[model samples]
Target: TEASSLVGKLETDVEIKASADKFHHMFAGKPHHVSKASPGNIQGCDLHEGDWGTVGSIVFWNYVHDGEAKVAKERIEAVEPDKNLITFRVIEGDLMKEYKSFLLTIQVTPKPGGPGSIVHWHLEYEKISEEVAHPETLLQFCVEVSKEIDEHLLAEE
Candidate 1:
């Protein structure tokens, strides 16, 4: 099993002062708008195939990470609206150069009896070898992007 030989799994959660529905909608339904919302981190997101918010959609992202430019091509693997979950599988680009496979999941849930939401970011990946570094930088990049998105959403309120 791939789990048995896993190189690393990274998980992080952030409390966002926004509606879970709105947060989930941004990622699952309107990701193309993300670049405008978080312009510093995301330059743009172009849908290469399929419709927005649908499974099997291919999206290409242009972004900056750690002061270096990068790009990624990913396919929407799953979208569970009821669970406020969306998963994307990296099929090409910079991440593939260092990892055998990369999967990213973003889950948003209402804060229990509260005003905001909890956003969870999960990354499951297998590196090409032991020498390859763990994806801490990428995880940090995601977190930063999430914060930027959160700020954008809040400003919209």
Candidate 2:
């Protein structure tokens, strides 16, 4: 399928020393407060429409990537508390410059046998053209933000 080249998926995981419930609630219910938890990677998130955790609610974020300040506006698409998954779609943002569509699914779960949690970040994206590389920079940002968040969570305990 020639058309399939425009779409791609990316994933990565990081082990975090924190409860999955706190991690899930951070993104699903308190996205705007993420800045308070990780100002090194994120600056601010403002509710653009609806409530914080509601599906279809829009939130705009100011974040740092590669040391440059960037902004993205995303709409909350799905929240599954039972599964510790939250989905967000980029409705508009700097990412739209070269991406036709971008969506992120974050899943936080307890370690299979352990004392901490694991965070799985999934990126589902479609590019405007083949010249646009898969979003490595954006994905790396997830790793950074997640680490910072985990540190915040554990240190707060």
Candidate 3:
């Protein structure tokens, strides 16, 4: 007696005083540099297959969550440079133990009348069972990492 599918979604937006192209490039082009921007949270991002900024590429991330180390292997599902959108699908690692499927999407858009950019993070996922917890912590991780990257970019000015 198990349900066929259980879905959960979370979305958050943050304002960053950085160029949309540069911020989007961090995730869509040079994700490996994310560790440098958020050293405390992201330890490393390794390219496992394909190439940076390309669809079908696999990226492995080493990170810290809840003070514990974890890893996630994700594939680049979609990249819409024109829209400044990138989507990643989690294929393996710590997340899979609790989630049947997880998809993370990030969209960066320039502020209508401002110098900064607005970052949108959307997480769509399905849990393994009713006992599995919602991914609030994971969403927090994304927000924190986004802030760190924003600061890192601002400091470069």
Local accuracy of candidate 3 as per-residue lDDT tens digits, 30-52: 43432335546553454333455
Q: Among all windows of ten consecutive residues in candidate 3, which has the lowest summed lDDT?
A: 27-36
Question: Could you tell me which 10 consecutive residues in candidate 1 have the lowest summed lDDT?
Answer: 27-36
Model 1 superposed RMSD (Cα): 6.5
Clashes of each: 0, 0, 0
Error of 1 at 48 (Å): 12
- Over the stretch 1-157, how does candidate 1's per-residue lDDT look in tens digits? 4445756788888778878877766544443432345546553454333456478877666667678776666798998878988888988757777788888888888866455788888888887875574566667768776876687777774
TM-score of each: 0.70, 0.71, 0.69
Give the whole-model CA lDDT for all candidates, comma-separated.
0.72, 0.72, 0.72
TM-score of 3: 0.69
Error of 3 at 97 (Å): 1.4
**Residue pairs in collision within model 2:** none
